[PDB]
């Protein structure tokens, strides 16, 4: 780990909906009553500023501001990573997957400002809407992904797997991952040339190290060979998985 | 009487250096502080605050007249170049700096190189093991020429002064090319090299003769 | 009358702390470097008696990618427009996206009064820089800096004469906001002549549904009469004095004024109000000269 | 360029390729000191180190059959006679290091 | 009061030696890590971090008062020389060396050479079985002056030690070259050969007699 | 205290060896491998790698007090004079070798 | 130096080269052991090795037909008398390598 923190806003997105004129699906019903519109704002309100405190139990964070809008949890990211997408997962049951969430989670320095700690990492939430409604900000402007595509893939099999597929391989097996961030990079320019360069560097991991212990490499070379020539929204899912790592351990 | 000389030359740098810049995130590929760049952009730059910060350094500790504590109270015969918030003769800085920006790509991408920052693999012996903490630097390529500007003015009051204003500058030049510009430069990062210092105007109000 | 077009790189422009910064700055901060560089050359006594002559007069930094641009109407529209009504939902998402907008095109100052809404061009990101200082325990802050790109450049309307053009022929190598001893200020001055023909409607006289820039400031004997039934936003703009002769340098007054593109009913006066907290021997000026726009 | 250079490749003959990169430890070598020598001089200085260049491909086309086969379908001599300027020489450094990419790749 | 003390060099391989480089990319024949070079060019260049780590642990072995355990806390009589950053009293280096750069290319093509390094092969053996892991290195040529150039320089205080420094600087140049200098170098692959050791004064305040 | 000791001496080859240098590409007339020599130059040298390697093995057979198996490990009285990377007590080598060039070029010719 | 080198050595005779790579095992590095010692000292002091080189091509062109054929079409006696300078020497040096590798390009 490192000694710095990460600050998030979780901040509800769509709102004139569910309030105003949203409950219309059959001509008998009215579905305009104020208290059918009134037990919208009592159910969410539950859990954005009650279940707050039961959620953020046993962790290394201190959630401020916890109100039914925007939120403020600052601590150590060990934690508010695993707090931010597990919290999405227990709204979206509690509303059958009709309201989406986005956030925004950003890291920053030791004894810094907290003006522009927390107006830096509030420009990442307008700039999670120019998709659509369903983005995510990731720790820059450039990771705009979908959200829903980081559990099921990104935090799914994807930095999970280097977890126990390379953590047997330690200061000269990790020489490498510095390298293959710069190459996801450089596309645009550098599109065929790039191609070619990628298959020297899964040569040059499996020839320098022991004979018994290749039988762990054997499928990371085809799923990391395969995520860079298919997509152009997948090549930025392993810069985040391979970034991921290197925070993990260090120093 | 109210005259603009301007100090245009080109750094030119014989040996890769390395300055910490803010977060990660335009070079995530090291283990430190990386190098500030551009943005908007992906160019190598350096800030101005880092040639006021060093020079003045450099050149209070030969054209001093007391044991030096605590900065802008310190030889009030250079103080009126870079700053003082406790003289009332003197606050602004006449001496204008400005960001380096990399010019030098206008003919690189024609000899085909790399990049633009490479990374060192240094460590340390702690005298009772071999290899401790694998670390690794991020430090900057070699030629690489860059645009400093160096702005002069006048206030009236700057008139049986000006020779001898011209001696501390030159000297502070040249001085500055024979020590480290950057981070951890005692084995040799730093040390620049001035290349074509000349001076002009673009007021017009006093002419140009101790060029060099 | 006459536009200054001026583009910045990596500059600096506070906006209530030293850290922060804003893509713009406010009109007083270009009155107040003038007047303080004037002294300095050798004419302090002669852009005394020219400020204080109505016509002349000064603008706010507006953006220029290719054509000037114009800050959006202060409560304009009004609700009659409703963009294209097809859900309650798309309709409330998009109102918001005009309350971020900073500045319109100069084509569009006619269409979006009858009904168009469009989100803002992205001019530049707001970049940060860190600093230090090794000899003294360690301690380090936090300042942020203004990149421009795209070609994003700014222009100033003053008037023309035989003497302004010459003051700010020296700003271009000064600095001119921000931390000014780095070089978060230089900029190159672009003099033109013939400004745009659409551009002509910056009038004094008459009162027409006009819109007051530059933060106004009404005078006494006119505040309440023009306040009634219009549209504004309260700012802030004050800090430290920078004298040469007081030796504790005291906290100018908070002079609480408006916004850039706020829309009343009738015309101002424009006046220069003296801050002048406990004694000194000069007066800090100020420029407090809203102009109107025909809209 | 870096095109035909992943399915030239691949059309060989008899599986399990024989040779290594052990027994090529030098005609990929020389190439990458003409590529930092001919961005710091001019062209018409290193004509003697082109004519050596061209020797090691020939030497090698008659001490083992798994040159043979790499010389006459990827056109080596071929283009060593085209190159003429200094901006087509730096193209031919750069296509011998794709072939060894791939080389590695399905086999090693 | 203020001088500027450069011991200009020509730093003499007699012996290929090998240092531990960053990315294998300097030629596609290797298997292990190469030597660290230039990122613009590709000349076989020897960085300043590999002097001073190694200078000063070949002497504060000699010229120390307690057993070392750690790296900046041994020996107070050269602490200052290379530098501190636990003592109050001093924390900037007054000895700055300089990455040296290989600039014997001026008559190195004129007698026809293969190329700029070689490959060596190296292997082991299990004392149970043959050839044991073929692996293989890359050294460096013979016969390759460097330009080395220590910067010295004063403040005020030192007065009643300059002769002791010189005895140190005198002492630690002649023994490293009774010494490997990179890494692997147990089996005889640095040991330097400083030719032509001058120093010259460029701000001109002190009188050069300590020549040799 | 700390003290320089150089054994000087002169190896004389009183028979022909021969020594698996690097590339065989010394010469356009062998087929094996030849002896490694000088990169710049052209003269016969010897490393100083196949002296470590084979003074230590000849010398761990006879002042040794357990049968060996893996290198850097067998014989703590010996191990001091090369070195070895698993003793916590000492990991730098205090026989420093060097690489025997040729200079019987003074009178061959 | 190499361009009329692949020409003027494929014009022979009768095919199937008799004279192999064993044979021709003293001509060839003879040459080797003066290009790496003009680099070292000048070339007014190896006038002694010139003299002995030219000797041993005329002492095989009479104990084998195969090398008779050689010399008058390659001019190998010819080249060694225009020969006088560092780096005409140096020169001559390089094209008999170069006859060597296009020799087993086509046979052996
Ligand atoms: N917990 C809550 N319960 C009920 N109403 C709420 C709650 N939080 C916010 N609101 C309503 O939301 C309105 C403000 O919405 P806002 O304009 O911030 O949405 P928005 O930012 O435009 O959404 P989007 O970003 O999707 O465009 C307020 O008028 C308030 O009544």
Redesign the pocket.
Known sequence: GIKRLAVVRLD?????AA?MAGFSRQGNGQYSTLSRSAT??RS??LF?KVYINQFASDKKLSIIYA???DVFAIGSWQDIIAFTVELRQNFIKWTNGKLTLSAGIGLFADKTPISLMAHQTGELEEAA?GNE?DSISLFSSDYTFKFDRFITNVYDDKLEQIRYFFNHQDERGKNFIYKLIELLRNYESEEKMNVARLAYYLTRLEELTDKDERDKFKQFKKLFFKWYTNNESDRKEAELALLLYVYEIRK | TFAKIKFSAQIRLETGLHIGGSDAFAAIGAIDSPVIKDPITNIPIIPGSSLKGKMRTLLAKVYNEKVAEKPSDDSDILSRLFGNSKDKRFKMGRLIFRDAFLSNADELDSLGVRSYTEVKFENTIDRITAEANPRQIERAIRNSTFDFELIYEITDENENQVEEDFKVIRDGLKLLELDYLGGSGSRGYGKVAFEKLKATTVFGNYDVKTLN | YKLYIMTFQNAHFGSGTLDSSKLTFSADRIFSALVLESLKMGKLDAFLAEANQDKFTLTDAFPFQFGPFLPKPIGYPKHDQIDQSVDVKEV??QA?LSKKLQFLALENVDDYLNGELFENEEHAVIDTVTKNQPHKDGNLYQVATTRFSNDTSLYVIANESDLLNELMSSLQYSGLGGKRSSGFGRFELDIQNIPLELSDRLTKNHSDKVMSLTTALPVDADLEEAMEDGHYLLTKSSGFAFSHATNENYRKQDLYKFASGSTFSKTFEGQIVDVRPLDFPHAVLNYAKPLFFKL | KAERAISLLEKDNKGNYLLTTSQIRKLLSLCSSLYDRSKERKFDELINDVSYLRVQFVYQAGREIAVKDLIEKAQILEALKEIKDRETLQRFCRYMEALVAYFKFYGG
């Open positions: 509800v997105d769509d709102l004139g309030f919208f704002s969410m309100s954005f109100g039914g809008d809407k409604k | 409330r998402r918001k």
